[PDB]
Amino acid sequence: QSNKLIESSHTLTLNEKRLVLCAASLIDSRKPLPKDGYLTIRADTFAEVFGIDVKHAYAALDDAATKLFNRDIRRYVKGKVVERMRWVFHVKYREGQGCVELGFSPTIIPHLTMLHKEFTSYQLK
Amino acid sequence: QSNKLIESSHTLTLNEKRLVLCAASLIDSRKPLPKDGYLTIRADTFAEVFGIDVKHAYAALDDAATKLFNRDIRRYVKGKVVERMRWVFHVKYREGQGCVELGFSPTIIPHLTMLHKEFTSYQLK
Ligand SMILES: [Hg+2]
Ligand SMILES: [Hg+2]
Ligand SMILES: [Hg+2]
Ligand SMILES: [Hg+2]
Ligand SMILES: [Hg+2]
Ligand SMILES: [Hg+2]
Ligand SMILES: [Hg+2]
Ligand SMILES: [Hg+2]
């Protein structure tokens, strides 16, 4: 069902995985989903949460958001792609505020906490 | 401001322009925004509105939906990209039933009207 999202995440680069999980973590499973799926991700906190030097953190998010934006998750039947979907449909780079804005697709934002719960369950150490 | 959608609607190929127009019809001024953002387009109903060799209508609709999906509406500031966005975030290929389903981005719907405007602003006959 939603395992596909979990499948697709395996194929993402390290920082892309981070970006998505970091966004997930900013969601409150108890309350409603973010308006239109918008979530802001600051470099400093990203750089702290993972072990990165904040001095270059923004560059990292920039590249990461851009790679995510370019992802194309597809479904096939035989050799033909039958369905195409994006993780995000909108990205705002804000080097001034040191953050990036991500608009997660309608069909995506509802599975983010599910992803978060999954990554947590394999967090052994 | 939202004059970038018209300025970007230039980049689309004729069919793409048609897709965005066709999917701009199935909306009302009385009634609010569509059913979420999804609009189904039939290859038959396509040749009817635009006159096409109904024999290859679907394949056209396909190529067009794919290209629209690959467009990158982006803005520049001082030569660097500062914002990226997609016309659509989801596509379903239902060749078996001669049609494609298109998920229009939340940032695109509030303009499928203002867009439909200008498009007829070039009609003379
Ligand atoms: Hg985070
Ligand atoms: Hg977490
Ligand atoms: Hg910010
Ligand atoms: Hg979903
Ligand atoms: Hg139409
Ligand atoms: Hg129209
Ligand atoms: Hg159909
Ligand atoms: Hg808009």
**CA-closest candidate to residue A64, choices A8, A24, A1, A22:** A22
Amino acid residing at B23? A
CB distance A83–B103 less than 8 Å? Answer: no
Q: How far apart are CA B49 and CA B53, in angstroms?
A: 12
CB atoms within 10 A of CB A98: 16
Q: Which residues contact A10 (CB under 8 A, 6 or more apart)?
A: none
Longest dimension (CA), chain B: 48
Task: Find the A98 Cα to ligand 3 centroid distance in Å.
Answer: 6
Distance CA A54, CA A43 (A): 7
- Beta-carbon-side half-sphere exposure of residue A88 (alpha carbons within 13 Å): 27
Kindly list the distances between the CA atom of residue B41 and the CA atoms of A40, B8, B44, B106, in Å, as whole numbers in the listed order: 34, 22, 9, 19
Instruction: Choose among A52, A44, A35, A34: nearest CA to A100.
Output: A44
Nearest-CA distance B124 → chain A (Å): 35
- Reported as half-sphere exposure (CB side, CA atoms, 13 A), residue A32 has a value of 5
Pairing of strands B88-94, A80-85: antiparallel
The DSSP letter of residue B9 is T
Q: Could you give the CA distance from residue B54 to residue B61 in angstroms, rounded to a whole number?
A: 11
Which residues from A are below 8 Å from B81, CB to CB? 93
> Which residues contact residue A4 at a Cβ distance below 8 angstroms, ignoring those fewer than 6 apart?
A73, A75
> Nearest chain A Cα to B36, which residue?
A106
Q: How far is A9 from chain B (nearest CA, A)?
A: 17
Of B16, B85, B23, B98, the C-alpha closest to B55 is B98
What are the percentages of helix, strand and coil residues in chain A, rounded to 5? 45, 25, 35
Checking phi first, is residue B74 left (phi over 0); if not, alpha (psi -120 to 50) or beta? beta
φ/ψ of residue B29, rounded to 5: -90, -35
Rounded to an integer, what distance in angstroms lies between the CA atom of residue B93 and that of residue B95? Answer: 6
Shortest alpha-carbon distance between residue A97 and chain B (Å): 12
Residue burial B36-59, b: 16+ Cβ < 10 Å; e: rest: ebebebbbeebbeeeebeeeebbe
Residues of chain A that touch chain B, judged by Cβ-Cβ distance less than 8 Å: 36-37, 66, 69, 80-86, 88-94, 103, 105-107
Distance CA B90, CA B101 (A): 8
Solving technique: X-ray
- Pairwise CA distance, residues B55 & B40, whole Å: 19
CB B113 within 8 A of CB B29: yes
Q: Which residues contact B84 (CB under 8 A, 6 or more apart)?
A: A66, A69, A90, A91, B72, B73, B74
B1-125 CATH fold:
Arc Repressor Mutant, subunit A (1.10.10)
Q: From CA A28, how far away is CA B93, in angstroms rounded?
A: 34
Q: Identify the contact set of chain B against chain A, taking CB-CB distances under 8 A.
A: 36-37, 66, 69, 81-86, 88-93, 103, 105-107
Q: Which two tokens stand for residue A59?
A: 């560059």
Tokens linked to A28 = 């409150």
The residue type of B119 is F
